[PDB]
Amino acid sequence: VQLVESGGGLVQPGGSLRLSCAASGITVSSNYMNWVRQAPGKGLEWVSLIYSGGSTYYADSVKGRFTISRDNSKNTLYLQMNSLRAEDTAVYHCARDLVVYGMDVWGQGTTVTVSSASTKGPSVFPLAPSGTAALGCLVKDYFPEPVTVSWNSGALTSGVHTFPAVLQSSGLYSLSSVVTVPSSSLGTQTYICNVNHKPSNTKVDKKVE
Amino acid sequence: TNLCPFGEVFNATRFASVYAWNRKRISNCVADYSVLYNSASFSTFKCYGVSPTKLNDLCFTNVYADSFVIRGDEVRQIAPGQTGKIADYNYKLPDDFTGCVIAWNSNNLDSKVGGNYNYLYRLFRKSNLKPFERDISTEIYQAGSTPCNGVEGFNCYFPLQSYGFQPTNGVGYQPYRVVVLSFELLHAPATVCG
Numbered sequence A: 001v002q003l004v005e006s007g008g009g010l011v012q013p014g015g016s017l018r019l020s021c022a023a024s025g026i027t028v029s030s031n032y033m034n035w036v037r038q039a040p041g042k043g044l045e046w047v048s049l050i051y052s053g054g055s056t057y058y059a060d061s062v063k064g065r066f067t068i069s070r071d072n073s074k075n076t077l078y079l080q081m082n083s084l085r086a087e088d089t090a091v092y093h094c095a096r097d098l099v100v101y102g103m104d105v106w107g108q109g110t111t112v113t114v115s116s117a118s119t120k121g122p123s124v125f126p127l128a129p130s131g132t133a134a135l136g137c138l139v140k141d142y143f144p145e146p147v148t149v150s151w152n153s154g155a156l157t158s159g160v161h162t163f164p165a166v167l168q169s170s171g172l173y174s175l176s177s178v179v180t181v182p183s184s185s186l187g188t189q190t191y192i193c194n195v196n197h198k199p200s201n202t203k204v205d206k207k208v209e
Numbered sequence B: 001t002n003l004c005p006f007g008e009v010f011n012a013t014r015f016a017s018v019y020a021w022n023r024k025r026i027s028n029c030v031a032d033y034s035v036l037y038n039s040a041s042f043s044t045f046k047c048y049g050v051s052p053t054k055l056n057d058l059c060f061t062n063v064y065a066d067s068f069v070i071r072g073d074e075v076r077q078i079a080p081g082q083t084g085k086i087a088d089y090n091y092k093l094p095d096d097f098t099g100c101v102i103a104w105n106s107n108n109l110d111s112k113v114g115g116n117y118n119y120l121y122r123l124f125r126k127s128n129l130k131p132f133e134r135d136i137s138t139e140i141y142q143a144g145s146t147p148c149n150g151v152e153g154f155n156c157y158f159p160l161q162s163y164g165f166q167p168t169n170g171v172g173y174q175p176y177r178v179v180v181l182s183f184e185l186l187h188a189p190a191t192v193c194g
Ligand SMILES: *[C@@H]1O[C@H](CO)[C@@H](O)[C@H](O)[C@H]1NC(C)=O
Pocket: B006, B007, B008, B010, B011
């Protein structure tokens, strides 16, 4: 019993995309089916309902831009998104509603991003130091998501803190990754952060000193 | 020149479930519709295709008084071109409906303190109802590719649920008695006037 979402990706503001929800274990046309999205770090927002009998309902934030459809033999629920905006950037789930018995089957979802953003490249700047000391690496101005930050090519893991990215005013992400090491080992151990941004074909090893 | 038995529908002690609605057939009688609408006892008295005050001066071949019980939230759905669980799976009015919908709150008569589960609606059905379709089939609804064979469980549920009417429910979650008067046409001779 599964609900498998597809179709998610990147869309410019004002563009359109269609999401897919492949099912097995339940037959979609007989069930109430729901689309529910989750913006980054927000809560659950109901989006689109569709009765077994084909009656549709939409939340006011998407009324007129979204269309909910299905397809019996393909057992696949869809969601057509038009005139997309930045708010609609979220993870989108499909679920089977039993109304009284709630929604008992969900899908892990597909991620949707909206931005007139480009791709650029994550500039890696060092966070150099001058009981315990701290050094890090500032990964700044890359977009879209995400980046992987390891240390000493994976050797050093104890004390590492990789922060969740923040989205700057420019429409550009940025995060930090730090590590606390004994203050003495500053002169003896070499600390290099390993950064990789697969969208922009960008891998960097920066030495912090 | 006998008077119509509208009292027998409106003032009936027990009403029906909405999925199993009634059709009292009215024929061969005079109806004072203006006695009914000036009653001012209805929170909803909304006709379609005809005027309530001009109704006295009219005739029809057959008048159908459909009556059932729903919540106040769903009263909006007893209208042409509505969606929702009542409009789709229990009682559907045609987009060319030409009668009256009358409703009044029944929380005094139709709610017990411990909970009155006598009234029911249809929650699961594979397709919408045709206009004036009554569906009384209690067949286990199949949700999966795997058939049910009259055994509840996963993807196999009872098609009917129960209204939970308590006097402390919200006004929308309270019971409203509905009477739907459907009017036909002539060509054939008429039997109901005023
Ligand atoms: C219901 O009974 C009351 C009390 O006698 C009466 O006033 C009212 O007209 C009746 N309703 C109908 C539709 O006859």
